[PDB]
Design an enzyme around this catalytic site. Structure first.
Site, mmCIF file in Angstrom:
data_model
loop_
_atom_site.group_PDB
_atom_site.id
_atom_site.type_symbol
_atom_site.label_atom_id
_atom_site.label_comp_id
_atom_site.label_asym_id
_atom_site.label_seq_id
_atom_site.Cartn_x
_atom_site.Cartn_y
_atom_site.Cartn_z
ATOM 1 N N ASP A 61 0.872 -1.170 0.000
ATOM 2 C CA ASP A 61 0.000 0.000 0.000
ATOM 3 C C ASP A 61 0.914 1.226 0.000
ATOM 4 O O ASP A 61 2.012 1.192 0.561
ATOM 5 C CB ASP A 61 -0.893 0.013 1.248
ATOM 6 C CG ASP A 61 -2.070 -0.950 1.142
ATOM 7 O OD1 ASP A 61 -2.859 -1.027 2.106
ATOM 8 O OD2 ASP A 61 -2.209 -1.626 0.100
ATOM 9 N N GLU A 118 -8.413 -8.871 0.182
ATOM 10 C CA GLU A 118 -7.738 -9.486 1.320
ATOM 11 C C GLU A 118 -8.356 -10.825 1.696
ATOM 12 O O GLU A 118 -7.655 -11.753 2.112
ATOM 13 C CB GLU A 118 -7.783 -8.544 2.520
ATOM 14 C CG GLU A 118 -6.975 -9.027 3.702
ATOM 15 C CD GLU A 118 -6.924 -8.002 4.809
ATOM 16 O OE1 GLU A 118 -7.896 -7.914 5.590
ATOM 17 O OE2 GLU A 118 -5.916 -7.271 4.886
#
Ligand SMILES: O=c1ccn([C@@H]2O[C@H](COP(=O)(O)OP(=O)(O)O)[C@@H](O)[C@H]2O)c(=O)[nH]1
Ligand SMILES: COC(=O)CCCCCCCCO[C@@H]1O[C@H](CO)[C@H](O)[C@H](O)[C@H]1O
Ligand SMILES: [Cl-]
Ligand SMILES: [Hg+2]
Ligand SMILES: [Hg+2]
Ligand SMILES: [Hg+2]
Ligand SMILES: [Hg+2]
Ligand SMILES: [Hg+2]
Ligand SMILES: [Hg+2]
Ligand SMILES: [Mn+2]
Length: 261
Positions: free
Chosen positions: A127, A219
């Site tokens: 990220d 995820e």
């Protein structure tokens, strides 16, 4: 190629590395914690292979604002000494900051792949709203790796926020699961990362057609994939932390990659 003569502390068979944490999974994959590795030996091994690491990040909309700190800190802590190729996927190419890079490191801006196979040996996907605060190096490189989510590393599988609906391809029952991996930091060889991304993309398409969205999206699918395809290395929470929300517990000798306040 043979390693050269090296002088370092002899490993002690009757002296455990860490006695406070699990350093190897049941499928014999190392769990990476500070104290478990000699970075000099590892740097030698990977440099002898002229290893190239690709670091991929997505910076869309206002997230382009996190690029400067991300790249600047990556220059100080990420794979220093090795060949690094940053791949920044963004909708604002002109907004990417002009960061000064060390030798052997380059950055490519892709506006929003076989290219990866010919350009890098390993892919690391993270990220962008993060910053490196300490060493993140070749100790993480392996065919496939996942990172322990900082909120569940000490939790029982029943507490894991896996997708619990059998109608979803990301479904994982209460009696299954090794760890809860966070989607903010994963990677491996280009081949394995592409296999993972391909599998998740197809699984999400199936859910889409069945009118369902995994509780934690990508995820949830990442966790289903890593449950069925065991990672060859697992990174400790040293690699994904938030000091403001979780502090700095004793079990973490170093805070390497963290959220930006
Ligand atoms: O509008 C967005 C939303 C997310 N991201 C990327 O997706 C990542 C993960 O989402 P986010 O950080 O917002 O949630 P977290 O993953 O922090 O729960 C972000 O860090 C960015 O790298 C982005 O580029 N544009
Ligand atoms: C982006 O910053 C980080 O990745 C550093 C670690 C953040 C830890 C957050 C702990 C609280 C829960 O976070 C949420 O956990 C769910 C799963 O239960 C999902 O992973 C969410 O994306 C995450 O924000
Ligand atoms: Cl990515
Ligand atoms: Hg050790
Ligand atoms: Hg990636
Ligand atoms: Hg990513
Ligand atoms: Hg998947
Ligand atoms: Hg996906
Ligand atoms: Hg995935
Ligand atoms: Mn994030």
């Amino acid at each position: 190629v043979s390693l050269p003569r090296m002088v370092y502390p002899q490993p002690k068979v009757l002296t455990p590395c860490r006695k406070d944490v699990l350093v190897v999974t049941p499928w014999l994959a190392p769990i990476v914690w500070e104290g478990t590795f000699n970075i000099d030996i590892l740097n030698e091994q990977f440099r002898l292979q002229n290893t190239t690491i690709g670091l991929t990040v997505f910076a869309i909309k206002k997230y382009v604002a996190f690029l400067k700190l991300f790249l600047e800190t990556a220059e100080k802590h990420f794979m220093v000494g090795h060949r690094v190729h940053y791949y920044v996927f963004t909708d604002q190419p002109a907004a990417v900051p002009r960061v000064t890079l060390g030798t052997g490191r380059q950055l490519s801006v892709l506006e929003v792949e076989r290219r990866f196979l010919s350009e890098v040996d390993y892919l690391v996907c993270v990220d962008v709203d993060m910053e490196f605060r300490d060493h993140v190096g070749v100790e993480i490189l392996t065919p496939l790796f996942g990172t322990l989510h900082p909120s569940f590393y000490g939790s029982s599988r029943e507490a894991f926020t896996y997708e619990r609906r059998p109608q979803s391809q990301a479904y994982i029952p209460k009696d299954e699961g090794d760890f809860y991996y966070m989607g903010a930091f994963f990677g491996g060889s280009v081949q394995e990362v592409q296999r993972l991304t391909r599998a998740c993309h197809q699984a999400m398409m199936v859910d889409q057609a069945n009118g369902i969205e995994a509780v934690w999206h990508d995820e949830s699918h990442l966790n289903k994939y890593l449950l069925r395809h065991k990672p060859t290395k697992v990174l400790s929470p040293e690699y994904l932390w938030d000091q403001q929300l979780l502090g700095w517990p004793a079990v973490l000798r170093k805070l390497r990659f963290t959220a930006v306040p």
